Design an enzyme around this catalytic site. Sequence first.
Site, mmCIF file in Angstrom:
data_model
loop_
_atom_site.group_PDB
_atom_site.id
_atom_site.type_symbol
_atom_site.label_atom_id
_atom_site.label_comp_id
_atom_site.label_asym_id
_atom_site.label_seq_id
_atom_site.Cartn_x
_atom_site.Cartn_y
_atom_site.Cartn_z
ATOM 1 N N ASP A 234 0.856 -1.064 0.208
ATOM 2 C CA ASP A 234 -0.165 0.102 -0.049
ATOM 3 C C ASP A 234 0.889 1.101 -0.038
ATOM 4 O O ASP A 234 0.498 2.454 0.432
ATOM 5 C CB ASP A 234 -0.990 -0.079 1.357
ATOM 6 C CG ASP A 234 -1.617 -0.743 1.209
ATOM 7 O OD1 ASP A 234 -1.975 -1.992 0.283
ATOM 8 O OD2 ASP A 234 -1.778 -1.900 2.479
ATOM 9 N N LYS B 188 2.275 4.668 -1.484
ATOM 10 C CA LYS B 188 1.810 5.761 -1.568
ATOM 11 C C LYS B 188 1.579 7.037 -1.222
ATOM 12 O O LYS B 188 2.728 6.692 0.486
ATOM 13 C CB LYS B 188 -0.363 5.702 -1.284
ATOM 14 C CG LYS B 188 -0.883 5.400 -0.512
ATOM 15 C CD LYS B 188 -1.698 4.741 0.453
ATOM 16 C CE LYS B 188 -2.320 4.762 1.478
ATOM 17 N NZ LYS B 188 -3.813 4.809 2.383
ATOM 18 N N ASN C 156 1.600 7.331 3.232
ATOM 19 C CA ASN C 156 2.803 6.711 3.372
ATOM 20 C C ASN C 156 4.322 7.123 3.168
ATOM 21 O O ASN C 156 5.003 6.644 3.797
ATOM 22 C CB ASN C 156 2.263 5.317 3.269
ATOM 23 C CG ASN C 156 1.179 4.530 3.772
ATOM 24 O OD1 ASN C 156 0.319 5.603 4.632
ATOM 25 N ND2 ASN C 156 1.119 3.948 2.871
ATOM 26 N N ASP D 206 3.949 2.022 7.643
ATOM 27 C CA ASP D 206 3.065 1.708 7.179
ATOM 28 C C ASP D 206 3.976 -0.388 6.636
ATOM 29 O O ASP D 206 3.608 -1.437 6.307
ATOM 30 C CB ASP D 206 1.692 1.683 7.221
ATOM 31 C CG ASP D 206 0.471 1.929 8.389
ATOM 32 O OD1 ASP D 206 0.845 1.959 8.603
ATOM 33 O OD2 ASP D 206 -0.389 2.406 7.677
ATOM 34 N N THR E 202 -5.964 5.414 -2.676
ATOM 35 C CA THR E 202 -5.230 4.212 -2.867
ATOM 36 C C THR E 202 -4.969 3.835 -4.595
ATOM 37 O O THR E 202 -4.288 3.071 -4.601
ATOM 38 C CB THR E 202 -5.833 3.643 -1.978
ATOM 39 O OG1 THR E 202 -7.112 3.341 -2.551
ATOM 40 C CG2 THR E 202 -5.860 3.823 -0.915
HETATM 41 N N1 LIG Z 1 -1.315 5.569 8.097
HETATM 42 C C1 LIG Z 1 0.035 5.824 9.707
HETATM 43 N N2 LIG Z 1 -0.016 5.038 10.430
HETATM 44 C C2 LIG Z 1 1.237 5.543 10.800
HETATM 45 C C3 LIG Z 1 1.271 5.084 12.018
HETATM 46 C C4 LIG Z 1 2.011 5.330 13.410
HETATM 47 C C5 LIG Z 1 2.533 4.560 14.254
HETATM 48 C C6 LIG Z 1 2.663 3.327 14.369
HETATM 49 F F1 LIG Z 1 3.205 3.099 14.487
HETATM 50 C C7 LIG Z 1 2.227 3.046 12.807
HETATM 51 CL CL1 LIG Z 1 2.473 1.311 12.400
HETATM 52 C C8 LIG Z 1 2.733 3.755 12.105
HETATM 53 C C9 LIG Z 1 1.038 7.135 10.666
HETATM 54 C C10 LIG Z 1 1.901 7.717 11.472
HETATM 55 C C11 LIG Z 1 3.391 7.997 11.439
HETATM 56 C C12 LIG Z 1 4.162 8.930 12.333
HETATM 57 C C13 LIG Z 1 3.137 10.107 12.482
HETATM 58 N N3 LIG Z 1 3.909 10.972 13.178
HETATM 59 C C14 LIG Z 1 3.651 12.570 12.745
HETATM 60 C C15 LIG Z 1 2.012 12.506 11.857
HETATM 61 C C16 LIG Z 1 1.134 12.053 11.997
HETATM 62 C C17 LIG Z 1 2.054 10.587 11.793
HETATM 63 N N4 LIG Z 1 1.268 9.433 11.539
HETATM 64 S S1 LIG Z 1 0.392 7.806 9.506
#
Ligand SMILES: Nc1nc(-c2ccc(F)c(Cl)c2)c(-c2ccc3ncccc3n2)s1
Length: 431
Positions: A130, A132, A135, A151, A169
């Site tokens: 996924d 994109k 991400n 991710d 997506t």
């Molecule tokens: N689709 C998304 N998944 C995550 C994510 C967050 C925690 C995790 F353990 C995992 Cl595996 C994925 C996002 C994310 C990550 C860091 C960030 N730091 C500042 C602002 C937004 C953020 N969003 S966005």
Amino acid sequence: AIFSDRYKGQRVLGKGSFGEVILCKDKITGQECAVKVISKRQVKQKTDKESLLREVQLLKQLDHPNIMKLYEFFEDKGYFYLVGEVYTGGELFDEIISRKRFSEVDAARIIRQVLSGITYMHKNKIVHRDLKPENLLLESKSKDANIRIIDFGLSTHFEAKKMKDKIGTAYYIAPEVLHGTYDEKCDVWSTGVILYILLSGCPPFNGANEYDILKKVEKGKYTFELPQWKKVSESAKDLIRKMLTYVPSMRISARDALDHEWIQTYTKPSLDNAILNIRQFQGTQKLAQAALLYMGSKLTSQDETKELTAIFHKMDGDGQLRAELIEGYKELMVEHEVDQVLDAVDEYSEFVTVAMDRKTLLSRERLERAFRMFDSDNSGKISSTELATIFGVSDVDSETWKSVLSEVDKNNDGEVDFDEFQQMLLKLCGN
Ligand SMILES: Nc1nc(-c2ccc(F)c(Cl)c2)c(-c2ccc3ncccc3n2)s1
């Protein structure tokens, strides 16, 4: 191990794939963390629990400068918690749209970082699937900032069709993912799609709606026959051709894409049309998302106000209630945090009306920002042609939004201002 025994929520960071993302703080060390909360009832698992634990344990031990760092994983009866590092630079395309100039060197520097992250994860047998723009987060909101891929590894264990989640997506999915047999080459295809957008500002596979984009992806035919491609080198076009090769065994590997002459030459002329197109692209995606969020938030607030009036009535028929207003909010849902939200609002009917009107104004302001951003010529209006593109990306039927448009304003002359656009969204979610 319990999540709430270690971390406290600070503020929301955004919407992630499979769940909500909250900025949290370790209660002892003060370390800030991004936590993704996956609801077990609204996601579902496509593998056995033993396979998920094994993948998480491997992911926690991997380390690359272009891959998000995963620190912890918790699970309770109703949720999974993915705890990782906070990247404050925003989404990559949101940084690119703010630039006045963008060249093939800027594009190659970006794609080299994505390809470095991918090459590392494929050596460790992890597939993204996924990949994109959403991400791809930046460590800082500036040029030459490090890109972190988010991710990498979840798709193999969580099931993705909520419209607000599916938006943006279809452009990037590899054709073999659609048909079911896919391996790590699907991540090269998606990177090829991202590269095509960086250099032209337009997706290689496009259409009026989700299914029309997927039809073009499934056939896998695309062209460099747009005026903006005349100002791009043949080496960049040659890499895109190898990355967007239909048969996965014939598609170039991520390692071989790093060793391509384009990457090695341009990462040692402004694409003005590409910057103009990518702004239009990001604006369209962001206004479709905002429109779906607004409609979703209006149904959530309508449902919560109906549930809140029942809880506050049963707790009374005087018609008046400070302490009981707190207990009622916790029944629908930190005691210090809840007290402060009710102190900001300050008869339970007038309180329910003031608390709802405050949520409605904040919902209107998020949608308005996205509308203003889409309206790059500051005309105050969006045309019927632009509405067709927006509602196409958000999967709202053509005859349905045109009927709603007629009901809002019979004498619209193929345009809508913000207030009329907002009124149409209200009619499309039963208001
Ligand atoms: N689709 C998304 N998944 C995550 C994510 C967050 C925690 C995790 F353990 C995992 Cl595996 C994925 C996002 C994310 C990550 C860091 C960030 N730091 C500042 C602002 C937004 C953020 N969003 S966005």
